[PDB]
Amino acid sequence: GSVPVILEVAGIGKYAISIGGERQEGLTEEMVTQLSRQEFDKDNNTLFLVGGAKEVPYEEVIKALNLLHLAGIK
Amino acid sequence: GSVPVILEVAGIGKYAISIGGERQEGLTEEMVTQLSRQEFDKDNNTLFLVGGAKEVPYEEVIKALNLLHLAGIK
């Protein structure tokens, strides 16, 4: 609530997540879903933001946002 | 560089931007482009992230990412 949830696109199927200051790297798409869903179910007002690195294509960024929508995050 | 650039989708055509701790609200799409482009041209390694509020549709989030791509931000 106080500190947003940040999901970072690192490449193809590789993602990083920042939860209230704590950053988790080397996560899979299925695992990132688990975490995103668990945080959204415990706090239904958590601000969610998605960013990708320069080496990440915009198409991949779309996929990430798509995964969040699939699990009802955004 | 040290502090990312955050672009927040507030609704339809309304956006907010956080630059190194400073937040700007009530920005237009054309104006948000100006700022995003100026920051990216001065610092070509600035981490960029996009997040939307619960009342914002995913389709609008796509549009925002689309605008960034158009100006060569991501």
UniProtKB/Swiss-Prot annotation, chains A, B:
Topology class, membrane: Single-pass membrane protein
Cellular location(s): Cell inner membrane
Keywords: Cell cycle, Cell division, Cell inner membrane, Cell membrane, Membrane, Transmembrane, Transmembrane helix
Organism: Haemophilus influenzae (strain ATCC 51907 / DSM 11121 / KW20 / Rd)
Family to which this protein belongs: Belongs to the ExbD/TolR family.
Gene Ontology molecular function: any one: transmembrane transporter activity
Protein's gene: tolR
Top-level taxonomic group: Bacteria
Protein name: Tol-Pal system protein TolR
Location (main, coarse): membrane
Record-level GO cellular component terms: plasma membrane
